[PDB]
Symmetry: D2
Subunit: 138 residues, 4 copies
Amino acid sequence: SLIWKRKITLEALNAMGEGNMVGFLDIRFEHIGDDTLEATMPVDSRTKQPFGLLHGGASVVLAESIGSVAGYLCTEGEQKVVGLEINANHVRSAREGRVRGVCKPLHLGSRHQVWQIEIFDEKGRLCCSSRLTTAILE
Amino acid sequence: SLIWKRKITLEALNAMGEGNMVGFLDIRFEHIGDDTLEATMPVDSRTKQPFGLLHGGASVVLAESIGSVAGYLCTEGEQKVVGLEINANHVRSAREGRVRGVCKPLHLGSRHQVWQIEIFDEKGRLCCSSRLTTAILE
Amino acid sequence: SLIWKRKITLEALNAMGEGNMVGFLDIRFEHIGDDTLEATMPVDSRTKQPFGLLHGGASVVLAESIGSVAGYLCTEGEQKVVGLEINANHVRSAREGRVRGVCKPLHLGSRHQVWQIEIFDEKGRLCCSSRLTTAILE
Amino acid sequence: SLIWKRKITLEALNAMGEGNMVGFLDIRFEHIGDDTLEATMPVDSRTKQPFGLLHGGASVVLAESIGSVAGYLCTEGEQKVVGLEINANHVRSAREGRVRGVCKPLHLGSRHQVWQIEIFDEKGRLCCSSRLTTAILEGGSHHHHH
């Protein structure tokens, strides 16, 4: 199923993060299915807490970053999306490597959207499950 | 009305982010009342999204960073807190200066804690309100 | 702090629940301040979980019930609100009497709103903290 | 696979609700799978808001009700689960019939669990998506030296 309303390439996406938070974290997308969007992120002196574990906020940064663009790719023309509510359950820690976020839609309405982003570690072990609720602004 | 079970100094506390995400982002705790813990964060290239505004994940990184430490200061001995769930509602954007997050407890149990982190802009306007649920581990 | 764009009395307000869940759970509005709405609900056979304590879901029905109407009162004309997301933390259980829900705004925009509802037991202690995000419909 | 640690019949599962909220909203567990639990709820005057539609709070009642027991079934002995926090997205309304809740585990930790409950209408359309985080409370007698 194709949910995307706009067309884009990993090239353009990754370009977005340069100059802002997304950039200074090395978050790079790596897939764009018909109804799915993936991305990864490291685990170092930028995405870790004072104990050397994948910071929970880092996972949310990753979740929101992907959900935001994905929601955008589901709109038309001058439309835009703004994240309203986000939540996440940290069910497993991470200390090294890169985590991959898999974003899928739970609901794509005309005025708002709900995105689910599951984050897994290199071994494929689920570390975080988050949801993003956005509003479509004309 | 005094909740802390571990005495700490802003100096030693701020020291926490000396090589981890909390440092790279310039988060600096500035207050330690009987039941509240504050800390500001810079709204710059490091914490902004592709459009120049504060990134929603930055708001959550701040929340979860202030909540993790508040929770820890409320345990004793070898105990530790692990973040379980976090939720945030972005009610207002911010594009300049420093955002302040005021953390207070909603509940301080013996097994779990619930923290409320309200993030304001330099104008004192709520920008993000979030809750962090922690688990106390022996 | 007069947030209400509409006018309504406790009498008219409570008459909304007759014949629906609100009236069936005996949820009763008891205060309309300039920027807050308060309502009580019994902790009984209709609101308890299998072990004699207040069902967490009942606390959420109270929360959404107060937040929905409050949202309405903050619009006007043919405008109406629709709940998008609601979350809550159960921090203390209630076993008897009635709990009291207190709702106040966190954001009232032209497109959506965020409401915070705190639920207390008969002793004035926090039992549930929740947030509701609505969307305004023209 | 089999996540359940306790063996319960649907009959015994539904008997738990008599006399309380679950029984009063006619919430009926109708299926226990290897790693899923399902319950139904009528969309009527007891569960509708003033405008004649399914009350979002009811949906959360259904979700927490299913999630709570699923969490209990995944604990042995006198152990127990306590609901910590819940969240839900209302993505579509309902006005008649029943809605069905389908609870799957997202995490079955040693100290806490995360449950996902999706509520569907008659046509299999998602009306509410919810997550419940619970804490496991230890229980049972302990050996002591003598």
